[PDB]
Ligand binder design. Structure first.
Ligand SMILES: COc1cc2ncnc(N3CCOCC3)c2cc1OCCNc1nc2ccccc2s1
Ligand SMILES: [Mg+2]
Ligand SMILES: [Zn+2]
Length: 323
């Protein structure tokens, strides 16, 4: 477990957020990218606004973040930057649907978004299973996603890092099930079944938000909506984030080609030309259905569907030779 330092903690505790951002952060389309030095500060602020100021002991909270950052590897996409990106969309979702959720779910989900891809190796579940990796042996399904929760807990157990010190064991075991379910749900393999049922719930008007099974499903989707939110940004930010993604995908494809095995077209850098078409398929199969059903259940999240459709037209244009 990579532990943080004190001068990192002393610099972050004396962090104001510039007043121009105070308005900007609240918006769904907000792009954190240009404020790398402000991300630990931006997450502290987001936790502060959603769960209240005096919620976590700020010594611990600040300590928890910089070790979360240290336990993200340097890889093209699934990194510290990504985690904070995913955390902001959740902040925006939670802010615009506040009383729909509870202290422990808001505190739990924001942390879980920040922790949701901890120590990602730039490898998908297919790979790790296809080559009998240690992690795939210990976790048969949702392979990385279970390791992420395993890692999330390992950080909480560290010296003065347990930000849930002031929770009763009841609350503490409640909050770890919110986090675990949320982190497992980011496994896209599960989303498809999750979204299918939530649409059938929604269409035959029987979703009840204080029905406990529906909460975990609705929260399950929210994590997918947060994980995929590069598609909900402005067009240039999306084109740039798609590169970061494919650079991780093709990295994974190179390793296959060293082992003498054809990678899937998504992970072949020698199929760059199909990128325009491949995004279109993901947008129609995954993204649009994700944010349509979310907007249906939480109407204040409509700007996610809005911007998703904007970036669908852009990929539609790129295939139609008008980039
Ligand atoms: C915005 O994009 C993505 C975002 C993602 N965010 C999270 N998880 C993902 N995956 C889902 C897949 O298993 C690993 C995890 C994501 C996949 C994405 O790419 C869209 C798919 N691209 C394709 N490019 C090509 C190129 C040639 C032929 C076919 C295709 S399909
Ligand atoms: Mg993941
Ligand atoms: Zn993720």
């Amino acid at each position: 477990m990579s532990i943080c330092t004190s001068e990192e903690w002393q610099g972050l505790m004396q962090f104001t957020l510039p007043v121009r951002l105070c308005k900007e952060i609240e918006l769904f389309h907000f792009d954190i990218g240009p404020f790398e030095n402000m991300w630990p500060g931006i997450f502290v602020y987001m936790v502060h606004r959603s769960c209240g100021t005096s919620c976590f002991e700020l010594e611990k909270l600040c300590r928890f973040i910089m070790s979360v950052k240290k336990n993200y590897r340097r890889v093209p996409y699934h990194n510290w930057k990504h985690a904070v990106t995913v955390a902001h969309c959740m902040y925006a979702i939670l802010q615009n649907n506040h009383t729909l959720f509870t202290d422990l779910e808001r505190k739990g989900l924001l942390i879980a978004c920040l922790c949701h891809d901890l120590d990602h190796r730039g490898f998908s579940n297919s790979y790790l299973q296809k080559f009998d990796h240690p992690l795939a042996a210990l976790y048969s399904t949702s392979t990385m996603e279970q390791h992420h929760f395993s890692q999330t807990v390992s950080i909480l157990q560290l010296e003065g890092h347990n930000i849930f010190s002031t929770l009763s064991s009841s609350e503490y075991e409640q909050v770890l099930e919110i986090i675990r379910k949320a982190i497992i749900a980011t496994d896209l393999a599960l989303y498809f079944g999750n979204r299918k049922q939530l649409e059938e719930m929604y269409q035959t008007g029987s979703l009840n938000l204080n029905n406990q099974s529906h909460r975990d499903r609705v929260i399950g989707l929210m994590m997918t909506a947060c994980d995929l939110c590069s598609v909900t940004k402005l067009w240039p930010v999306t084109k740039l984030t798609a590169n970061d993604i494919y650079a991780e995908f093709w990295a994974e494809g190179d390793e296959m080609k060293k082992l003498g095995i054809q990678p899937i077209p998504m992970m072949d850098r020698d199929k760059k030309d199909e990128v325009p078409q491949g995004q279109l398929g993901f947008y129609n199969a995954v993204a649009i259905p994700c944010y349509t059903t979310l907007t249906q259940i939480l109407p204040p999240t409509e700007p996610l569907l809005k911007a998703c459709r904007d970036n669908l037209s852009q990929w539609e244009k790129v295939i139609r030779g008008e980039e």
